[PDB]
Amino acid sequence: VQLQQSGPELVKPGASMKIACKASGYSFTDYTMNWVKQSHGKNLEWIGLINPYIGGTNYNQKFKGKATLTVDKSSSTAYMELLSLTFEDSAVYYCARDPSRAMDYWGQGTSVTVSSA
Amino acid sequence: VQLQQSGPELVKPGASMKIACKASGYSFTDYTMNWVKQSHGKNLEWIGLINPYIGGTNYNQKFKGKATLTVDKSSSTAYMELLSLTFEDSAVYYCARDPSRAMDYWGQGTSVTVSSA
Amino acid sequence: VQLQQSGPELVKPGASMKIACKASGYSFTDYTMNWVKQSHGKNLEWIGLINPYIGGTNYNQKFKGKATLTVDKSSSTAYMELLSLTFEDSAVYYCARDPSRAMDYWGQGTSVTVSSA
Amino acid sequence: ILHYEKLSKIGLVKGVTRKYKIKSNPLTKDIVIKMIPNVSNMSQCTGSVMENYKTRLNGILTPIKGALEIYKNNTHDLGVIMAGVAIGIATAAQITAGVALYEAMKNADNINKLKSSIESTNEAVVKLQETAEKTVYVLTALQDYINTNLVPTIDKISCKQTELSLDLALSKYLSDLLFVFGPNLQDPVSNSMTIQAISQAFGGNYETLLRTLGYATEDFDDLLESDSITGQIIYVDLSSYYIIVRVYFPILTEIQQAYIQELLPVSFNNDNSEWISIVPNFILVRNTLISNIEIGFCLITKRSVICNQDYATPMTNNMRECLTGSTEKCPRELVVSSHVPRFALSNGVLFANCISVTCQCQTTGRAISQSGEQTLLMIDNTTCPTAVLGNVIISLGKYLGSVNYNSEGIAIGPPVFTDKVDISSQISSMNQSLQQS
Amino acid sequence: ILHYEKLSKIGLVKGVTRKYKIKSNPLTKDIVIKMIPNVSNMSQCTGSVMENYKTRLNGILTPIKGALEIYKNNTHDLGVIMAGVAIGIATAAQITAGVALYEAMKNADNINKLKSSIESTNEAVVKLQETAEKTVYVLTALQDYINTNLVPTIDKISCKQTELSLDLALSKYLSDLLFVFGPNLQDPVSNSMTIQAISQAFGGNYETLLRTLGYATEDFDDLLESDSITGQIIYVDLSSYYIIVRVYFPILTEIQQAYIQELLPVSFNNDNSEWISIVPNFILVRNTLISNIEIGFCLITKRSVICNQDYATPMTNNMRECLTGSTEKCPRELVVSSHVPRFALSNGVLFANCISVTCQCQTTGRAISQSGEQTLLMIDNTTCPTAVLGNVIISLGKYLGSVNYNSEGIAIGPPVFTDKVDISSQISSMNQSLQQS
Amino acid sequence: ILHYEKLSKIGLVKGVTRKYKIKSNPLTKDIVIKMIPNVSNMSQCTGSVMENYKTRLNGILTPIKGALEIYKNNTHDLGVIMAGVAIGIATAAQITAGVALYEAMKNADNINKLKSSIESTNEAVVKLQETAEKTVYVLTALQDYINTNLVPTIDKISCKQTELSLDLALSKYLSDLLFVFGPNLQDPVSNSMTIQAISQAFGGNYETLLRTLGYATEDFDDLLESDSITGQIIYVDLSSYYIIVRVYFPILTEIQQAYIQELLPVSFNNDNSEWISIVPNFILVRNTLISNIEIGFCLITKRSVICNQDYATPMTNNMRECLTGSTEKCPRELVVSSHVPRFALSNGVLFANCISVTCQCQTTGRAISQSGEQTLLMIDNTTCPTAVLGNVIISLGKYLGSVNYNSEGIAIGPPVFTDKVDISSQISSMNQSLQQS
Amino acid sequence: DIQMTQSPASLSASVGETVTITCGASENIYGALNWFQRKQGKSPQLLIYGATNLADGMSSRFSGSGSGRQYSLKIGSMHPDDVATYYCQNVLSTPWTFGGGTRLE
Amino acid sequence: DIQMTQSPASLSASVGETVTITCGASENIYGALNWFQRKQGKSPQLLIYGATNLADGMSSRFSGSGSGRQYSLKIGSMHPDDVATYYCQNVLSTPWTFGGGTRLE
Amino acid sequence: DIQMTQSPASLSASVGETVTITCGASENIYGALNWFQRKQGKSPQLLIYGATNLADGMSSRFSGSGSGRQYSLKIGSMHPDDVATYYCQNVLSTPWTFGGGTRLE
């Protein structure tokens, strides 16, 4: 049971970027993946979940519009497209597997930074 | 909002005659017309109602068979065919518009007299 | 109202025999035919019933597999095929008409004996 | 217009002819249903039960009040004009229901002038003086239970037990409530939801509601079971937790030139198989035009079929043509079940599948025989004044139709299979053979 | 007779085989349901509540008594005769029900000889001595409520509160009553109305009714939920306001040579799409003849399908032919929903749409791959003693069918759309292309 | 993707667009429902009522416990493996439900360690300390009635009356129970049975159950009425007569790229007849693919359609093509009923069958005339800022679609008859003409 | 039928003083009583529907009250215009009967 | 199965005096008990069904009673014609069992 | 949103002595509280779900308790390994919020 993140990315402000979360070692379709934003190394906040079985999503109100969650059942990969990136969007982004309510298996996280080098 | 009666008529006993009640100034189909019998200038008695929207009729027991109510939605006219006329059928016949349960607008009335001149 | 049994039979052990119960004088389809076993001239025990109207059967547990009840609505005949006959299957077998729950009319009975002469 | 002889020959035995009645001319009465009991007589140890109940009831009632306010804020007098842009999307029924809601706003305000008196109502039914000449009635949910069970037993049980019993009663009331006044009620504006559904706000006791409002006893039960006595929520109070319901008391009007002909379905014989014809068992004939009717939505009575609206539905050309005699166009379905009507009685005359049911003549003691080329047997006085069909013995009358009924063969329709999966498979086969052609 | 291998190849996974049972041989018990409570212990301040309740209950019960008297006045013994002319119009079921009503009239008169004792019944359940050797039971509606709530609290609440509570209880009883004994009850003669519906006269407490009458515990619940324990109103009293109901206690009889085969529907793949075959999920095979069954009217049990009548319905030729192997004639429907059964277990063998559901082999750790030309995958011991389908781990058995199941392709049926509106549109298209041809 | 202009021209008026929500991520809470009341406070004259009740309740619960033990004895940890051979026959839903039942067995055993405390529960709701940090709740059926009615009145009525009232209460509880936990419950393993059905074990009081367990108030009522808050019986006790139910509290997740388009059905004019098009009134569009939806199983809300599963069903090619503009492929049905929607409001714009409904313009006082070659009339600001349709007056807005809407004719579809019997007759006629060809 | 009875069949009083026109019903009609004003030679005009509600276009001096089976129509200050015949109509049960009629002079 | 027991297996009394043939049931059968008369060498004849109702064509002297699990069949004044074997049949539960049988001489 | 609060934001105690990490919720969450262990530079690990249940693969010394809105995570005997950041996650209401975080040294 593994969740492979896409990797840390340097992205310019106002652009859009996509986190990849490959899944292996379990039934991708039968588990919901959550997404959380780790900012400043301490604070965690849940972004949203995607249910690949039904195609449903449940977003945090803070992350509606800014983040949209997709899945690729063929590749067992769930994506998190981040829209209109600002400096505050620079954080650590996790994909966490969820049977129903307990994020038991997490990706290594993508430390996304938003700047123009 | 007008209810135009056909006019006073002289009709022979045992004949059949028809009151015309043209409607204007309102939705004919959406209003039920009642019919009442004013005998001896004083006494009033409800004959029956016709619902042009549904084609339904509700008759007073006294006037079943003697009076039949029809409507002409094309002409916005409701009719009162009177059957087997006797001397007691000589009275004033009103058509009264009724939204559901209150006769608010009345025709001028037809003073029908039954005799052989 | 009459129930004609097939008649007493001499049958060898281990063989199978069919008892006919012709019905007449009533509506065969509208009456349930019961079967009982009269052993030793005294003891009676209900074998099972057949409802010719529906094709349903309700057997005593003791007689499942040993007795199967069929009907012939064309001939108004109710049959009781007896399987794997033993010495204890030698008894008097009745077909009894039952409206719903009371065996009112019985056949004369078949005294079936099981032996090899 | 229906060829009853030919229909009976293919098992469509003429049943009871019924007159067609639809609700009309609603008498409107406004009643107050207070969804919260008055616990002032046991307030000493009520706890937080009433607060939680108010929270849940407010959550339930807020969507209703908002949906009402969609129309209360977009409807004004000229003559009553409705703001179509502000309403945005609505059906004709919902628009007329919003008009009716606006017309009920005057009496709603008159009643709401008695908000304090509605709150202080400590009986399940209380009459309040609106304006010293108009009276309004308050139906307090669970107030009967409070006054009859909880108040008399304050000191018999510990007041915590009284609190728990009150909480359980309120939660049971909410549980019964939610099926009607919950998220199912997405169109409270419509005045089509029955007074039986409305009475769930009073614990399902619509008898008390209607007897308290008062009604014309004529056709009252028939108007109830035809879903014609409807209620419309006019006002929702989120502070005193009561609703004002305008109850529509219509009358029954006979539809002109309209009768509903019931056909009693009877299996018949064709070839060596048993068949029942697939023809509607309730035929609406109006102004000499034959049509179907969604009679499941209506209340069928011995003399009339009573509906809350015109449920006439169109009839295909073939079914109209075969109901009028062209019985080769009426479809038939194989009978493989043992529980099918083998006979029916029409005007004292038996129409029976005497091949499938044993027909015996009680007078002459002979068996009424049906040939293989006969579908039914018409059994009447001319052949058998009394007949035994199975075990049931019926004394008959004279058949007013043809005298050569049992000797005149009929043209038979095409076999069908009215099962849903059978319908889909028949569509499959027809499409396949059509593509082959 | 059903080709279970080919059916499972198109997703019709063989389910539980059930025996076919239909009610038969009813034991008849007559019980009195007094539809009015005895308020003699609290008559001091009852007011006019009981008079109004009597008026309303008489209005409810009069149509029932009149409908019964239609048969009671036209039914005579020689052997039982009915005046078909006086009855006029009747169905076979209604005529046999009138016969049953007449046979119950003797015990009805014997019970009505105890009219005074029925009126004095002051308990919800009372046994009355008919003839010193036969006993009749009176079920008094709301008597339990009166004796348990209102009588103990006469002086605790003001007697006006007792009066109002009694009126509310009676009105609630009438409200629950009217769905059953109201204008919906246009054929009280029929003995097909269930005892659960009858018990609404006792407040819906059919458990008390049946335990009081007594019954065979064998298949009792199965007879209840199959609507086999029916009640027939035999006598209606408009003065004492009680009904005599003959309760039919049938037994269950296994239908000869009849089993109902359940097929577990499983989506399969054809081309690159999910498909579920439109085939009945419950196949009735009787005397080696395949037919449908309206199993919604029956009670499905783990071992048997229990009905109150033969609900066998005919099956079209194509469905019969494809259930026996010609799977090119079984229609299939596109699966566009995410919630479809992707697999089923039959005899310890998994039949799975391994293209649509992830199939992994728990023993060898390999993925059970399904080619695009395979509809399902049969997963058994020979390939995978244990298989993981999604997240569920299943240890399997040996497939008793073919060993080349997963390598033998099947002929596929035609796609269909079983939506009602889709059915109408398909009829439109077929008619259009037929007229074009 | 839907051609809303052409659809409105044939009466498919664009209604409220709703987002598509399906239950997901269930929060599991386990509660104890003790189906037997504690009569220790009134055991002095209980009699044999409790023994008979225990016998009946054991007979009811034994099939449930056996069906559960079928999976409890064939499921063990590896990682949760299921004995497919011992299960034999099961559906995918039932297998996953057995997995869920096994995962709930740990908490079930932890609760069953408090069997003695569950037995001693003498209140309808009691919190029990599982392990000094986890708490379980016991819902005792009829305990509220016992403590509130029977215990306070031991000496007020004779103890035989208390016994009879207790028996009646238990039997009423069983009568309400049997529709849910009786032979209808042949698959207690499935966690698809709603908490409202589960609450019949508590007297139908699911409000108490859910508030006692606790829940997210967000979308709670929507999850209730969409049948999304389901319960699964986890443990059945045949000695203490209690069940452990795991209540699934899911959340609502918006389906990606999925909206459900409601179409308001409005009659239109063709030839000189009134027509309504046979097109689904709720169109599910997901990922730019058009499909039907069994929305009857879902809870329609003002903003969303909320289902417990994906109820998408396939759409035929012709209906998809005509919903996108090819309106000659959308079937239409004759309107013979007087109660049909003659108009609808869409985006502040009226689409009306002005031939069948009197359209008058409130601003200029003129009549909005519909020619015989026009199906509907689109009435907006450009022609009539305020319009009177019958007696309802509607102030309109601007039609965002075409400005030549009322001058552009549309191609009309084929007439149909969507009656079941009419469908069978149409199949008959098509088969006959196909055989003739 | 419901027999609708008016006690003052003929009444004549001075202009400008209160006038009560009582109406009775054989059965309780629950406020389902309409009032009609019929001037000589002209059609009856709906005066008060629902036994309390003033019909539109009618003078505010018409203040009819009542509940159950006993009702009353109030004139208040007379005027020579309301010299007409007042009918109380049964409105509850389907044969909507009328009262005898009150001729006010 | 329900065990049906008859106490007087063999009974012989003078002609013309009352005779009670008691029958017992292991389980309460609620009046679902039939009585059958089986004369020597002939099929059993339905004597009393429902534990109270006299079967048609049977003599009026058969007055069987009882309720629950304990029943009784009464002969009253004998007749040499009623010398037969009386069976009480279980009628409630599906395996409709019979009693041991009472031979009256 | 439910505001999820942890009282000891930063705590450091000797190895081998009991440690209670209290967590609070603005609204009653009915035991729908998850605990997560986040070691430095690594993804958070599910520690205790349901506010009582120990997650698989986690040490038995984690004995988190609590009910309603006030919860607590117990460490018991420390070890150098569990020097990490502990998050209590709301799970009841759809915006599943996290606690501030407890850094244990």
mmCIF file of N, CA and C in Angstrom, chain F residues 9 373 404-411:
data_model
loop_
_atom_site.group_PDB
_atom_site.id
_atom_site.type_symbol
_atom_site.label_atom_id
_atom_site.label_comp_id
_atom_site.label_asym_id
_atom_site.label_seq_id
_atom_site.Cartn_x
_atom_site.Cartn_y
_atom_site.Cartn_z
ATOM 1 N N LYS F 9 -39.725 24.582 -27.171
ATOM 2 C CA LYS F 9 -40.687 24.680 -28.263
ATOM 3 C C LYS F 9 -41.627 23.482 -28.300
ATOM 4 N N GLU F 373 -50.048 26.837 -36.279
ATOM 5 C CA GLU F 373 -48.769 26.236 -36.629
ATOM 6 C C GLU F 373 -47.707 26.435 -35.557
ATOM 7 N N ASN F 404 -36.212 35.364 -32.705
ATOM 8 C CA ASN F 404 -37.195 34.841 -33.645
ATOM 9 C C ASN F 404 -37.781 33.514 -33.174
ATOM 10 N N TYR F 405 -37.876 33.325 -31.857
ATOM 11 C CA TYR F 405 -38.361 32.065 -31.303
ATOM 12 C C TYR F 405 -39.778 31.766 -31.772
ATOM 13 N N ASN F 406 -40.668 32.752 -31.675
ATOM 14 C CA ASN F 406 -42.072 32.534 -31.992
ATOM 15 C C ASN F 406 -42.345 32.498 -33.490
ATOM 16 N N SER F 407 -41.367 32.850 -34.324
ATOM 17 C CA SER F 407 -41.527 32.809 -35.770
ATOM 18 C C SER F 407 -40.806 31.636 -36.417
ATOM 19 N N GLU F 408 -40.017 30.880 -35.658
ATOM 20 C CA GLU F 408 -39.251 29.759 -36.189
ATOM 21 C C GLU F 408 -39.976 28.463 -35.843
ATOM 22 N N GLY F 409 -40.508 27.795 -36.862
ATOM 23 C CA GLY F 409 -41.188 26.536 -36.638
ATOM 24 C C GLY F 409 -40.220 25.416 -36.311
ATOM 25 N N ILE F 410 -40.738 24.395 -35.637
ATOM 26 C CA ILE F 410 -39.937 23.256 -35.210
ATOM 27 C C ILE F 410 -40.495 21.988 -35.843
ATOM 28 N N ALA F 411 -39.623 20.999 -36.015
ATOM 29 C CA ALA F 411 -40.041 19.690 -36.495
ATOM 30 C C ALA F 411 -40.629 18.893 -35.339
#
